[PDB]
Amino acid sequence: GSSGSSGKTDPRSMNSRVFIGNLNTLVVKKSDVEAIFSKYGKIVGCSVHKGFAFVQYVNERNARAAVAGEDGRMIAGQVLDINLAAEPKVNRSGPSSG
């Protein structure tokens, strides 16, 4: 059932998602992540939670764009760790395949 007030990552009905981490929400705003990402595709759903944020583009291609673009941006003087909510950058070293 539809649940209000939450922010998790569960497969329900989505594809185009971007997990904006290391987001200095203490300085960065939503419009900053909504506008900065507005160049990587139209945002249908964007949220920022003290610690991280989530962006939802109209299409994946767009999202993946930012995830590739945004990710590595110096916001507030600090880099932003973003990644598509699908493939977690867990354990770098190793045979990454699949």
PDB file of C-alpha atoms in Angstrom, residues 35-69:
ATOM      1  CA  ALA A  35      18.309  22.489 -11.568  1.00  0.00           C
ATOM      2  CA  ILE A  36      21.817  21.097 -11.845  1.00  0.00           C
ATOM      3  CA  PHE A  37      20.184  17.830 -12.841  1.00  0.00           C
ATOM      4  CA  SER A  38      17.593  19.595 -14.960  1.00  0.00           C
ATOM      5  CA  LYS A  39      20.330  19.730 -17.571  1.00  0.00           C
ATOM      6  CA  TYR A  40      20.625  15.956 -17.542  1.00  0.00           C
ATOM      7  CA  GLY A  41      16.946  15.431 -18.264  1.00  0.00           C
ATOM      8  CA  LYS A  42      13.576  16.509 -16.923  1.00  0.00           C
ATOM      9  CA  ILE A  43      13.131  15.643 -13.266  1.00  0.00           C
ATOM     10  CA  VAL A  44       9.840  14.029 -12.325  1.00  0.00           C
ATOM     11  CA  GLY A  45      10.745  13.269  -8.728  1.00  0.00           C
ATOM     12  CA  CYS A  46      13.646  14.657  -6.732  1.00  0.00           C
ATOM     13  CA  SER A  47      14.237  14.500  -2.997  1.00  0.00           C
ATOM     14  CA  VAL A  48      17.034  15.497  -0.650  1.00  0.00           C
ATOM     15  CA  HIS A  49      17.497  13.978   2.786  1.00  0.00           C
ATOM     16  CA  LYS A  50      20.086  15.128   5.295  1.00  0.00           C
ATOM     17  CA  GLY A  51      22.866  12.816   4.176  1.00  0.00           C
ATOM     18  CA  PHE A  52      21.825  12.159   0.595  1.00  0.00           C
ATOM     19  CA  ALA A  53      19.245  12.808  -2.096  1.00  0.00           C
ATOM     20  CA  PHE A  54      17.349  11.054  -4.862  1.00  0.00           C
ATOM     21  CA  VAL A  55      16.584  12.202  -8.387  1.00  0.00           C
ATOM     22  CA  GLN A  56      14.087  10.740 -10.827  1.00  0.00           C
ATOM     23  CA  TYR A  57      14.318  11.642 -14.496  1.00  0.00           C
ATOM     24  CA  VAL A  58      11.692  11.135 -17.175  1.00  0.00           C
ATOM     25  CA  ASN A  59      13.878   8.453 -18.710  1.00  0.00           C
ATOM     26  CA  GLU A  60      16.752   6.287 -17.535  1.00  0.00           C
ATOM     27  CA  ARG A  61      19.103   7.399 -20.286  1.00  0.00           C
ATOM     28  CA  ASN A  62      18.767  10.864 -18.800  1.00  0.00           C
ATOM     29  CA  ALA A  63      19.316   9.700 -15.240  1.00  0.00           C
ATOM     30  CA  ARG A  64      22.293   7.556 -16.171  1.00  0.00           C
ATOM     31  CA  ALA A  65      23.520  10.739 -17.811  1.00  0.00           C
ATOM     32  CA  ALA A  66      23.730  12.736 -14.603  1.00  0.00           C
ATOM     33  CA  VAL A  67      24.849   9.688 -12.658  1.00  0.00           C
ATOM     34  CA  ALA A  68      27.770   9.859 -15.058  1.00  0.00           C
ATOM     35  CA  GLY A  69      27.881  13.638 -15.236  1.00  0.00           C
TER      36      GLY A  69
END
